[PDB]
């Protein structure tokens, strides 16, 4: 019985012995404050005051985000760590049935126990929970293409009529999870139906540390982890890792440590009592495991590694100036708080080595998020598919507070050929509108785009999208050739001497470009390493 | 139940008597080490230690490669020599149906036995295996495929929700084979769903020698193979051959000999070098 003193409810929902360190979900910390204030705060105050304010409780919750982040974990923990009736779990398309009027009945049967208990008792009914998984499967926008059978509308209408209708009900809480909130109906996301909506993003570095400490907890307290494992270093090494890949990393390290004793296969499959009572996972296991789990958000970093497979030979002095300018621009975008969009153009003669310089700058920048768009990735697709790919890639870059994008060979992304001239207007317009849209509030971008047909871009009237130019002239003197040959190991010192001496006599205003020079050296290494072959090739190519 | 018990599992999952030399697959040695280390390594150690480490087992295995190079063979051998339950085979698009809502009910019926046995015997359950064949036929990227009635999205969502959902399973192992890995959905390859991905490729010279050795075995011990046949030379002449082509070569030479003999000369039947060279 409630005494005179205003003491908390008898059968509370959250109880007073609760703290966010007991759930077991690491990383997200502000989201939990928001969720636990908006929804589970009006069910703890004594019923009298909550009745004197004339407000009803919120009856909906939506969680959305990328794949492998923690949505279902939150749903599970919320469902089975409260004081309420058991959840009525429903998978994605687990509602549909074959007969004419059985799908809607399946959606109606979820609410009946709650209705009965609310009718019988009133405001003392225990909380009920039902959780919809993969919400974006059946509940799509009404009147859209698809669902030729008349099922896409009846289901949505039934759910709308049963969540806020002519008969009231305020002892339920329905929770839904999805990867795409742009397809859920528009009448399902208004106050009274799915009020609180929360986005769950990739973890921060300190978030990665928290997740790592959460996963390796039973391992540490049973004395099964070595003393040379430093979790901060592991958080540092993992860049594009989501919550669901740290688990894979830990379990791969455990497999490496296990496999030494019972060597599956071979003849060493015999378990020895001594060495399984002294098991210990060490640092080398984690470092080896780092080679198994490959993050899915960091594929482009491998292509930016491939781009520079030829190495940055610091011949000449102009290279250092270009790299310094790139570093300056990266620093400016990092520090300034008003410049939220910086775009560059890197133009020069064909074969001069632009993509390599752009890739080098981007790699040495050290940003969390780096991507690259190239003709290779778009081969064979159709126009609509290409536009869709470009739009998706540009949309993925609007999260996080620091971003870098490398657009390669602009003139060949629009199918240019000078006979007509022919080209694609749609792709050109899409890029022209994409390179001037500021990202959301509190974000920054740095777009570096290379080209080799400066004049064509001038004619199209697209030279206003960019902000600053960087020219890359090709080698002209004859000492640069000597430096390249020294760093390529073509001949002995004497050989370089003879080749340069002879070339002096039959080569005025030497002008080739590095990409061709390296190929000529490579092919000349077989036929006649003496002067003749290299001189002939460099004369015929210049 | 539990306590400190440093003794092998009650009903081990692999066997007391096993060795790669008798599996029947030749030319792939590194791949098998990787597979058996990552998948079947945590199912052999005593349950007490695995419980202490706070680990869960791997619930997927995808393996891909060009045509006719030994993928279905591995899927068959794994599912028949592991003291496990009877495999649940679904070959091709064998689930689609023409009644609304009955297409995915076939995907939810493959897991019923595993759930039923897990709910009763928690961690003493036997291993259940289900083999998906031609995985790329139905489980394409959701949202990109051409318009229709909306059955592709429902199938993909049903499998996604059943493989890793709000109710946990620790008995299931699911295997998938395909020739075009690019078409598979992006969310199915996340760790925890299809964690271990392996590639099977054309063999090199030693691989070709091993395949030849394990194909012509029952005709080498029955004393039905001549003494002038040398498998090293044959492994050297056949270049860029696959496993299926070597099997075809063997049975073609056998047919040559059998057709040649054609009353009771069958007692002396013997395959010779000339038959192999004509094949």
């Amino acid at each position: 019985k409630s005494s005179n003193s205003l003491r908390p409810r008898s059968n509370a929902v959250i109880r007073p012995d609760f703290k966010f360190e007991d759930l077991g979900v690491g990383g997200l910390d502000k989201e939990f404050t928001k969720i636990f204030r908006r929804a589970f705060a009006s069910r703890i105050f004594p019923p009298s005051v909550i009745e004197k304010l004339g407000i009803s409780h919120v009856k909906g919750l939506l969680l959305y985000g990328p794949p492998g982040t923690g949505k279902t974990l939150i749903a599970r923990k919320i469902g089975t760590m409260l004081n309420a009736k058991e959840p009525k779990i429903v998978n994605g398309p687990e509602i549909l049935s074959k007969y004419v009027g059985s799908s809607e009945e399946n959606i109606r049967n979820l609410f009946k126990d709650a209705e009965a208990e609310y009718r019988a008792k009133g405001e003392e009914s225990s909380l009920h929970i039902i959780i919809f998984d993969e919400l974006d499967s059946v509940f799509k926008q009404r009147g859209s293409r698809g669902d030729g059978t008349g099922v896409g509308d009846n289901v949505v209408n039934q759910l709308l009529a049963k969540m806020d209708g002519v008969d009231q009900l305020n002892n339920i809480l329905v929770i839904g999870m999805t990867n795409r909130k742009d397809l859920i109906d528009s009448a399902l996301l208004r106050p009274g139906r799915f009020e609180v909506q929360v986005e769950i993003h990739l973890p921060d570095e300190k978030g990665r540390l928290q997740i790592f400490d959460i996963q390796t907890k039973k391992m540490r307290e049973n004395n099964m982890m070595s003393d040379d494992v430093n979790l901060a270093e592991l958080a540092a090494l993992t860049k594009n890792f989501s919550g669901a890949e740290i688990e894979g990393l830990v379990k791969s390290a455990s497999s490496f440590a296990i496999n030494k004793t019972v060597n599956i296969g071979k003849g060493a499959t015999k378990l020895n009592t001594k060495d399984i009572a002294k098991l210990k996972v060490t640092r080398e296991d984690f470092l080896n495991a780092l080679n198994d789990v490959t993050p899915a958000f960091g594929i482009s970093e491998e292509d930016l590694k491939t781009c520079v497979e030829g190495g940055m030979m610091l011949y000449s002095e102009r290279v250092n100036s270009i790299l310094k300018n790139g570093a300056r621009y990266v620093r400016q975008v990092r520090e300034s708080d008003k410049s939220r969009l910086v775009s560059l153009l890197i133009h020069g003669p064909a074969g001069s080595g632009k993509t390599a310089l752009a890739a080098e700058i981007a790699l040495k920048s050290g940003f969390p998020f780096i991507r690259l768009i190239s003709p290779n990735e778009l081969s064979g697709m159709s126009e609509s598919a290409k536009i869709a790919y470009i739009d998706n890639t540009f949309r993925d870059a609007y999260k996080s507070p620091l971003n870098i994008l490398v657009i390669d060979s602009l003139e060949t992304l629009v199918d240019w050929v000078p006979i007509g001239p022919r080209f694609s207007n749609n792709i050109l317009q899409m890029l022209k509108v994409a390179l001037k849209r500021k990202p959301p509030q509190d974000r920054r971008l740095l777009i570096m785009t290379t080209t080799s047909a400066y004049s064509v871009l001038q004619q199209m009237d697209i030279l206003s999208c960019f902000d600053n130019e960087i020219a890359v002239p090709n080698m002209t003197n004859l000492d640069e050739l000597n430096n390249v040959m020294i760093e390529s190991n073509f001949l002995d010192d004497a050989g370089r001497v003879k080749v340069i001496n002879e070339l002096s006599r039959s080569c005025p205003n030497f002008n080739v470009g590095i990409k061709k020079t390296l190929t000529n050296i490579e092919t000349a290494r077989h036929d006649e390493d003496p002067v003749n072959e290299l001189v002939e090739l460099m004369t015929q190519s210049a | 139940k539990s306590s400190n018990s440093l003794r092998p599992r009650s009903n081990a999952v692999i066997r007391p008597d096993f060795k790669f030399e008798d599996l029947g697959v030749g030319g792939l040695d590194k791949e098998f080490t990787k597979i058996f280390r990552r998948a079947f390594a945590s199912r052999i150690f005593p349950p007490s230690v695995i419980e202490k480490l706070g680990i869960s087992h791997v619930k997927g295995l995808l393996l891909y490669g060009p045509p006719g190079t030994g993928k279905t063979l591995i899927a068959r051998k794994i599912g028949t020599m592991l003291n496990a339950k009877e495999p649940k085979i679904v070959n091709g698009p064998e689930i689609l149906s023409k009644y609304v809502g009955s297409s995915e009910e076939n995907i939810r019926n493959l897991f019923k036995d595993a759930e039923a046995e897990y709910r009763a015997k928690g961690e003493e359950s036997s291993l259940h295996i289900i083999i998906f064949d031609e995985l790329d036929s139905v489980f394409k990227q959701r949202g990109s495929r051409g318009d229709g009635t909306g059955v592709g999205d429902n199938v993909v969502n049903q499998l996604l929700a059943k493989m890793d959902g709000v109710d946990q399973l620790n008995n299931i192992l699911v295997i998938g084979m395909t020739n075009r890995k690019d078409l598979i959905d992006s969310a199915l390859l996340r760790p925890g769903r299809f964690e271990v991905q392996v590639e099977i490729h054309l063999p090199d010279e030693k691989g070709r020698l091993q395949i030849f050795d394990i194909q012509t075995k029952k005709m080498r011990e029955n004393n039905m193979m001549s003494d002038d046949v040398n498998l090293a030379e044959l492994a050297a002449l056949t270049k860029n051959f696959s496993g299926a082509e070597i099997e075809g070569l063997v049975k073609s030479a056998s047919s040559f000999a059998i057709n040649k003999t054609v009353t009771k000369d069958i007692a002396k039947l013997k395959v010779t070098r000339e038959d192999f060279l004509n094949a």
Partner: peptide, 12 residues
């Protein structure tokens, strides 16, 4: 690309 429902009659 078509699907179908189904209805049911009782016994005579």
């Amino acid at each position: 690309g078509q699907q179908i429902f189904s209805q049911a009659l009782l016994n005579a």
